[PDB]
Design a protein around this ligand. Structure first.
Ligand SMILES: [Mg+2]
Ligand SMILES: [Mg+2]
Ligand SMILES: [Mg+2]
Ligand SMILES: [Mg+2]
Ligand SMILES: [Mg+2]
Ligand SMILES: [Mg+2]
Ligand SMILES: [Mg+2]
Ligand SMILES: [Mg+2]
Ligand SMILES: [Mg+2]
Ligand SMILES: [Mg+2]
Ligand SMILES: [Mg+2]
Ligand SMILES: [Mg+2]
Ligand SMILES: [Mg+2]
Ligand SMILES: [Mg+2]
Ligand SMILES: [Mg+2]
Ligand SMILES: [Zn+2]
Lengths: 49, 308, 217, 115, 108, 153
RNA sequence: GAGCUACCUAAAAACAAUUUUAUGAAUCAACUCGUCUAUGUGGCAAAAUAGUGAGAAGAUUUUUAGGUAGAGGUGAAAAGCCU
């Protein structure tokens, strides 16, 4: 009966594993958006080349 | 290389011989120290009686710490614990060689290892047949009070009610400023003071065009020999050779101190009652109680004080 | 097994012999006078002989707000309010003019310091001088009183909300808005509790000390 | 510890203090070579435009062990001749006042409670 | 504060050639018995240590290849085996790292 | 005056000191042999010793888990501490870490360096300082003295 | 020589949230300015930094191009500004 902590990468570190974990954080804010406008707004709000 | 090289006691010893040498060196400490336990049966020097104006030897002790203490009047006295530890008489000079009117006895306490010491010090002790001691000190002793070298000294050499003087090196404070070294006021915090808060003010006057010798300036504070005068002895523990001395003693805990009868005017010839040459336990004239107290002291295990 | 705190040595470079010498003296006084078991927050009545009179006795009853000291110099503070005037006396357990110590009410409180009771309402500080002792159960654990006191206006003796005090006995919700509680958390040092070289483990020392105390009996 | 300009609580029943006034009394002088004032030390108050002598009977600063620390700086008013201005003191007074060098028997007589 | 006078080479030569400012000769330099290279008495040999770390890097490279990714540290003991060696009974149930080279003489 | 203080001042401050030591400890647990500056390795050695003590307490201990969680930033190491390192050091009462000084860093800062490792690891053995043999001239004379002393009472 | 700065012409921009109202109104960002103190004083800087402050839908601020030239220009006059 030992509650080992989940083996996941840190959220704040400066690595590739930690970046891919901050990507799922915003991606989850789309999953959890009720309306389709919010989903499309989140997916397109940030402009890049 | 055909040049100087460094060595220490452990460099060439094997794993087994490392333990063997440690046990051997400690073995020698045991036998040597038990040889000198009986001064009076080893050709003791003649024991002269006390005459007025005599000064007897003192002891070197280690500073254990402090504790509270109470008197039958209910007052609380902070007291310091001094342990007499491997204290032996080491060297004797006569009045002529010391160049003083009085003679000198060098005592030493707190036996130490033999492994990082100069050959000179080790030879000095090998002649005397003692393990090396941490520190030497010199005591001024009159001719009647001379004691043969190699004679151990014990806390019972002092008795409750006598006043004593302790000298030891003070705690070092490193390089310090002028406020903490000499208690200078300093300068204001605000109202326009620019980069001058803890600084010394004007060194001197404009006329003399120099700084007087002995002007107080920033420097290294502490680590100096200081002495405290007129400290009462409240109690002596004969089993552990502990002396209870009123008030504070210079130095840190585990610091070696020099204990000798007080030189203040009041207690000029108080050593009449005390063992004049020294306290000999080998004589065994009467066996001392484990704890010696001063009459005013309220001993623990006594009934609670009721100022009826 | 309740080992009185004063027996536990503080860490440092002082010799163990200095402690052994003191313990023997401490045990000697305890035989003459019995020092009851008590904790911070328990109410005590201490009868001491006054030195300003002819051995006449004085009595003071209060809650033990603080316990501190090692060896024969250990002390405990206890507060009360008399005719609407708070007073605190810092008694010395081994002072030879303490005639008797009676634990009127034995209990434990959420914190081991109750200095904040200076800023709490007077009710939490006032205790009846004439109150009779309450029963105790030896083969039981001491009760832990979980009372959370109510404070008077914010200007306090100290900043009890700050994380260094770690007070768990004050109703911070009533007296402080969440904005203040958030701001006060800017003085929090989360690493302190998790650095292993700052913890002084006394289990072995307590075990050896407990055996010696019983052996002397 | 009471100093110059400290704020004090008169613990008599005398009219000079008893009467509620928007300003408390403030210490103007401490009768010592040391500027600090402790239990049993006289001080000169400025109370309602009047300069009046007084005696400290308690303070918030810690003292030696086995003495009582109060929550307020308590003071009693004494006349120029030294007789207390007020006739009663209902607040506890420490018993150390008896043995301190000085004249405190008059104040002790007026005090019913001692701590 | 600025200099009132230029400082002479004779004054400067005393300051910067004072013994306090000279390089102190070292008495703690000795030879390593195995390699015959120089070392200080209280520090490890920098040549023998260099052998160990180069082998250590090779082993750590092999460990990474076996794991294949981050956060794959085993919960069981590890052991290193060289060509011509097979796990013993005591070696059962322990991660095994295999090295192409023969067992080094120092490594035991 | 810094008499009696048992810590070095490292990093940007007190919190920065812990995090710097925490990363070194995390590396030591994963790799079991680490190179760092002598001062930093000396500072981290104490935490390396105590961490193993917490592992010995056991997996089910909650205080050990919280402490292990804080210090090991990579959470895969938590099973390693409780199930690999702690079982290894069951017999010992202490002295789990071996720390030695290696030549100065050849990087223009000439830092004083040290290699810190846990005892019993799988890596190639370090070239430790080995004492002389009993067959040497000085040792034999000491060995000769030992035999006589024991045999003759 | 008006790519700085003073003033002007033409063509363009920016001002969230909150309360008032219907505003050279209010609180306060972005933005504009530079009150007080400390640091700095061959400095990060030939006028800055860090705090603290004033204005912040207007006589506001900003961008681009053009104009006025030394016996002169510009000036909500400080004999200010015109690299
Ligand atoms: Mg000052
Ligand atoms: Mg300043
Ligand atoms: Mg002159
Ligand atoms: Mg205060
Ligand atoms: Mg010269
Ligand atoms: Mg220092
Ligand atoms: Mg140090
Ligand atoms: Mg223009
Ligand atoms: Mg707006
Ligand atoms: Mg406006
Ligand atoms: Mg404003
Ligand atoms: Mg305004
Ligand atoms: Mg203008
Ligand atoms: Mg004008
Ligand atoms: Mg110009
Ligand atoms: Zn080598």
């Amino acid at each position: 009966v030992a509650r080992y902590p989940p083996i996941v990468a840190s959220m704040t570190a400066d690595s590739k594993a930690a970046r891919q974990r901050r990507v799922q954080r915003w991606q989850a804010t789309v999953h959890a958006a009720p309306s389709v406008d919010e989903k499309i707004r989140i997916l397109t709000k940030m402009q890049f080349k | 290389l055909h040049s100087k090289s460094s060595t220490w006691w452990d460099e060439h010893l094997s794993e087994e011989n490392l333990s063997f040498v440690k046990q051997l060196v400690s073995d020698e400490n045991k036998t040597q120290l038990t040889s000198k336990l009986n001064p009076l049966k080893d050709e003791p020097w003649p024991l002269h009686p006390w005459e007025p104006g005599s000064f007897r030897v003192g002891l070197i002790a280690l500073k254990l710490g402090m504790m509270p203490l109470w008197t039958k009047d209910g007052q609380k006295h902070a007291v310091t614990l001094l342990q007499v530890q491997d204290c032996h008489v080491l060297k004797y000079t006569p009045k002529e060689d010391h160049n003083g009117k009085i003679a000198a006895l060098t005592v030493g306490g707190k036996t130490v290892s033999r492994f990082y010491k100069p050959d000179s010090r080790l030879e000095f002790y090998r002649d005397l047949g003692l393990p090396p001691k941490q520190i030497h000190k010199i005591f001024h002793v009159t001719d009647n009070a001379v004691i043969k070298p190699g004679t151990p000294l014990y806390a019972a050499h002092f008795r409750p009610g006598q006043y004593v003087d302790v000298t030891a090196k003070t705690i070092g404070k490193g390089f310090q400023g002028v406020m903490k070294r000499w208690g200078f006021k300093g300068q204001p915090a605000s109202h326009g003071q620019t980069k001058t808060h803890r600084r010394p003010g004007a060194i001197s006057t404009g006329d003399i065009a120099r700084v007087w010798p002995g002007t107080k300036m920033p420097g290294r504070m502490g680590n100096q020999n200081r002495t405290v005068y007129g400290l009462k002895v409240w109690r002596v523990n004969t089993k552990h050779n502990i002396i209870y001395v009123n008030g504070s003693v210079p130095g840190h805990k585990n610091c070696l101190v020099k204990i000798k009868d007080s030189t203040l005017p009041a207690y000029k010839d108080s050593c009449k009652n005390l063992p004049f040459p020294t306290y000999f336990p080998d004589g065994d004239e009467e066996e001392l109680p484990e704890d010696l107290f001063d009459e005013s002291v309220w001993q623990p295990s006594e009934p609670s004080i009721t100022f009826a | 097994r309740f080992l009185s705190p004063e027996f536990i040595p503080p860490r440092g470079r002082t010799n163990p012999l200095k402690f052994k010498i003191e313990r023997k003296d401490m045990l000697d006084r305890r035989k003459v006078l019995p020092i009851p078991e008590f904790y911070v927050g328990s109410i005590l009545r201490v009868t001491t002989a006054d030195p300003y009179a002819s051995g006449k006795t004085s009595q003071f009853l209060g809650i033990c707000i603080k316990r501190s000291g090692n060896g024969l110099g250990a002390t405990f503070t206890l507060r009360n309010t008399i005719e609407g005037q708070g007073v605190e006396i810092c008694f010395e357990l081994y002072n030879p003019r303490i005639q008797e110590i009676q634990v009127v009410k034995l209990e434990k409180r959420l914190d081991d310091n109750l200095l904040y009771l200076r800023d709490a309402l007077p009710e939490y500080s006032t205790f009846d001088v004439n109150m009779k002792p309450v029963p105790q159960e030896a083969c039981q654990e001491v009760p832990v009183n979980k009372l959370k006191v109510k404070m008077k206006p914010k200007p306090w003796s100290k900043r009890w909300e700050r994380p260094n005090f770690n007070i768990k006995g004050i109703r911070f919700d009533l007296a402080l808005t969440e904005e203040q509680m958030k701001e006060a958390q800017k003085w929090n040092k989360p690493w302190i509790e998790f650095d292993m070289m700052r913890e002084y483990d006394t289990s072995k020392i307590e075990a050896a000390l407990w055996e010696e105390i019983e052996a002397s009996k | 510890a009471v100093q110059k300009m400290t704020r004090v609580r008169v613990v008599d029943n005398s009219a000079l203090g008893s009467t509620p006034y928007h300003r408390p009394p403030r210490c103007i002088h401490v009768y010592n070579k040391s500027g600090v004032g402790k239990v049993g030390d006289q001080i000169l108050l400025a109370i309602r435009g009047q300069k009046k002598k007084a005696l400290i009977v308690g303070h918030r600063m810690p003292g030696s062990r086995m003495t009582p620390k109060f929550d307020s700086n308590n003071v009693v008013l004494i006349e120029d001749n030294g007789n207390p201005v007020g006739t009663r003191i209902k607040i506890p007074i420490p018993t150390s006042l008896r043995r301190r060098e000085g004249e405190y028997s008059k104040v002790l007589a007026i005090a019913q409670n001692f701590v | 504060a600025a200099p009132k006078n230029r400082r002479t080479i004779e004054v400067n030569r005393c300051r910067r050639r004072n013994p306090q400012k000279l390089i102190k000769i070292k008495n703690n330099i000795d030879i390593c018995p195995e390699c015959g290279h120089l070392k200080q008495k209280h520090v490890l040999c920098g040549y023998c240590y260099e052998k160990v770390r180069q082998e250590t890097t090779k082993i750590r490279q092999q460990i990474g290849a076996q794991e294949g990714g981050p956060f794959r540290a085993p919960s069981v003991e590890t052991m290193v085996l060289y060509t011509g060696e097979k796990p013993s009974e005591k070696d059962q149930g322990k991660r095994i790292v295999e090295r192409n080279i023969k067992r080094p003489s120092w490594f035991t | 005056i810094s008499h009696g203080r048992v810590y070095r001042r490292l990093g940007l401050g007190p919190e920065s000191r812990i995090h710097l030591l925490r990363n070194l400890l995390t590396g030591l647990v994963r790799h079991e042999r680490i190179e760092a500056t002598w001062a930093r390795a000396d500072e981290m050695r104490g935490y390396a010793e105590k961490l193993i003590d917490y592992g010995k307490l056991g997996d089910t201990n909650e205080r050990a888990m919280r402490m292990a969680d804080f210090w090991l930033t990579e959470k895969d190491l938590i099973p390693k501490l409780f199930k690999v390192l702690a079982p290894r050091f069951q017999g010992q009462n202490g002295n789990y870490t071996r720390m030695l000084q290696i030549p100065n860093r050849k990087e223009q800062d000439r830092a004083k360096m040290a290699v810190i490792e846990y005892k019993g690891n799988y890596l190639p053995p370090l070239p430790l300082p080995h004492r002389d043999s009993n067959l040497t001239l000085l040792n034999q004379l000491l060995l000769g003295l030992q035999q006589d002393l024991h045999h003759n009472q």
